[PDB]
Each structure stands twice: as C-alpha cells, then as structure tokens.
C-alpha cells in the first residue's frame with residue numbers, strides 16, 4: 380500500500396523524475 | 410619497537426579489525442574479478458545520465474513512450490538477464 384501513496388508525494392514524484400532523467404541520459408544515442 | 414608492535418597487535422587483534430582487513434583484501438580480489446573493459450561504456454553512460462539529471466535545474470507513463478528511455482531500460486533489462494545466468 381506504500382507505493383500508491385508514495386507516487387502522489389510531490390517529493391517522491393520529483394525524485395523519481397530525476398532518476399528517470401538519469402535513466403534517459405544513460406545509453407544516449409550520441 | 411617491541412612495545413610498539415605489542416600495542417599494535419593488542420589493539421588490532423579484535424575480530425572487527427581482522428574482519429576489516431580480510432574484507433578489504435576480499436574487496437580487492439572481487440574488484441579484480443570484475444571485468445572493467447566492458448564497464449567503460451557503462452561509466453560513459455552513467456556520466457551522461459548524471460549530466461542529464463543535474464540538467465533538470467504522471468512521469469512514468471510519458472517516459473515509457475520515450476524511445477531513449479525505452480532503449481535504456483531495455484539495456485538495463487539485458488543487464489538484469491545477464492546476471493544470475495544459468496551457465
């Protein structure tokens with residue numbers, strides 16, 4: 380039940396967006 | 410010098426210090442076992458990813474459609490498949 384409540388957390392949302400930006404950056408087409 | 414060595418061994422002889430030195434040697438051995446020739450592209454990708462993350466001054470659904478994100482997560486899943494190989 381923790382993940383559903385956590386996804387709505389603005390801090391968690393921003394942090395996971397940062398991790399997904401990290402994920403996008405790696406494996407770049409270049 | 411005998412007193413110095415005595416102090417050194419009597420302080421070190423604790424199991425914590427012996428475990429610390431043993432695990433340092435084991436860490437060196439494992440880092441030697443780990444192959445780094447393939448790890449240089451991974452380091453470059455990590456550099457690019459950290460740069461993109463620090464560049465940023467409902468997200469996952471939009472991100473999954475990103476071709477870059479899709480390819481990157483496919484690479485991570487290939488990494489996940491490679492580890493724990495049946496061999």
Ligand SMILES: CCCCCCCCCCCCCCCCCC(=O)OC[C@H](COP(=O)(O)OC[C@H](O)CO)OC(=O)CCCCCCCCCCCCCCC
Nearest residue numbers: 380381382383384385386387388391395398467468469470
């Ligand atoms: C008409 C309206 C009907 C209901 C209307 C709908 C009822 C359900 C509403 C949605 C519930 C989940 C929402 C989304 C949760 C967050 C997004 C998500 O999916 O996040 C996956 C993550 C798993 O963790 P990850 O491994 O991905 O973690 C990442 C890395 O691994 C970390 O390192 O969180 C979860 O799974 C938590 C949810 C658990 C399952 C939810 C469904 C169970 C019950 C369904 C049936 C109930 C009875 C139905 C009776 C019919």
Ligand SMILES: CCCCCCCCCCCCCCCCCC(=O)OC[C@H](COP(=O)(O)OC[C@H](O)CO)OC(=O)CCCCCCCCCCCCCCC
Nearest residue numbers: 382383386387395398399402467468469470471472473474
């Ligand atoms: C008839 C048509 C009906 C609608 C028709 C459908 C309406 C919904 C469409 C689908 C929405 C999600 C699609 C899939 C999203 C991406 C895949 C996924 O699942 O990715 C899990 C990840 C969780 O992150 P992870 O922890 O896994 O991260 C990994 C590591 O952990 C990192 O390190 O993203 C999310 O959960 C984002 C989605 C949040 C929940 C979506 C549902 C909420 C609302 C449902 C009810 C709405 C009202 C319904 C009213 C009835």
Ligand SMILES: CCCCCCCCCCC(=O)O
Nearest residue numbers: 380381382383384385386387
């Ligand atoms: C539809 C919910 C039925 C009751 C489930 C109770 C346990 C939910 C999960 C709690 C947990 O993950 O620790």
Ligand SMILES: CCCCCCCCCCC(=O)O
Nearest residue numbers: 380381382383384385386388
């Ligand atoms: C009737 C069910 C209420 C569930 C409220 C859960 C509160 C604790 C959530 C876990 C947390 O705050 O880290």
Ligand SMILES: CCCCCCCCCCC(=O)O
Nearest residue numbers: 386387388389392393467468
């Ligand atoms: C069905 C959507 C109702 C409105 C939800 C608004 C918040 C969505 C989550 C935004 C975030 O994770 O930062």
Ligand SMILES: CCCCCCCCCCC(=O)O
Nearest residue numbers: 406407408450476477480481
């Ligand atoms: C979208 C397809 C190209 C993105 C992934 C390219 C980086 C993986 C290969 C890197 C390398 O050959 O060292």
Ligand SMILES: CCCCCCCCCCC(=O)O
Nearest residue numbers: 393396463464465466467468
């Ligand atoms: C209406 C919701 C707006 C969400 C904006 C999220 C940040 C977008 C810009 C990201 C950045 O480049 O810092």
Ligand SMILES: CCCCCCCCCCC(=O)O
Nearest residue numbers: 396400465467468469471472
């Ligand atoms: C009416 C709702 C429009 C949502 C558009 C969200 C744009 C910002 C998404 C976050 C990002 O670009 O990183």
Ligand SMILES: CCCCCCCCCCC(=O)O
Nearest residue numbers: 489490491492493494495496
């Ligand atoms: C599909 C079942 C075998 C895959 C996992 C095998 C590796 C795990 C054990 C490795 C080891 O014994 O050192």
Ligand SMILES: CCCCCCCCC(=O)O
Nearest residue numbers: 382383384385386387388
């Ligand atoms: C349909 C209204 C009742 C369910 C809403 C639950 C929201 C919980 C939350 O904010 O995480």
Ligand SMILES: CCCCCCCCC(=O)O
Nearest residue numbers: 469470471472473474475
């Ligand atoms: C059914 C059409 C309207 C919903 C489509 C939303 C697509 C959003 C996206 O491309 O991530």
Ligand SMILES: CCCCCCC(=O)O
Nearest residue numbers: 380381382383384385386
């Ligand atoms: C009435 C219960 C709906 C599903 C809730 C699932 C959850 O958020 O753990």
Ligand SMILES: CCCCCCC(=O)O
Nearest residue numbers: 380382383384385386387
């Ligand atoms: C309209 C019913 C909404 C149930 C889902 C709630 C949630 O997962 O935040």
Ligand SMILES: CCCCCCC(=O)O
Nearest residue numbers: 386467468469470471472
């Ligand atoms: C009309 C809204 C459908 C569910 C959207 C869920 C999401 O992508 O965050």
Ligand SMILES: CCCCCCC(=O)O
Nearest residue numbers: 467469470471472473474
């Ligand atoms: C036909 C309705 C599609 C809703 C789901 C959209 C998405 O999650 O990309």
